[PDB]
Ligand binder design. Structure first.
Ligand SMILES: CCS(=O)(=O)N1CCC(C(=O)O)CC1
Length: 93
């Protein structure tokens, strides 16, 4: 049975006007800006951008990859696919 999301979990993350995007739940570093309540810091692979999202927009990677894990034309998407599959826990700073 599922637990709540935790730092290191891999997902496709959905934001308005974008295809479901490979991403991970990030840690918050000491001294770093915390997300609003009920929100998680989401690091998007490929673009290397962060946004704050709630669970409604977070699709666990293993379950969803056969649907969402396909090449897309959008900038940084295919880079993103490589990273989630090949080094999802690396530093991309
Ligand atoms: C979600 C795909 S993305 O990595 O291109 N990026 C789009 C702009 C987003 C924002 O509006 O905050 C951050 C995420």
């Amino acid at each position: 049975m599922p637990h709540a999301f935790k730092p290191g979990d891999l997902v496709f993350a959905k934001m308005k006007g974008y295809p479901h995007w490979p991403a991970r739940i990030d840690d918050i570093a000491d001294g770093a800006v915390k997300p609003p309540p009920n929100k998680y810091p989401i690091f998007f692979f490929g673009t290397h951008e962060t946004a704050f999202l709630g669970p409604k927009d977070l699709f666990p990677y293993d379950k969803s990859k056969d649907k969402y894990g396909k090449p897309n034309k959008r900038k940084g998407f295919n880079e993103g696919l490589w990273e989630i599959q090949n080094n999802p826990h690396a530093s991309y700073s």
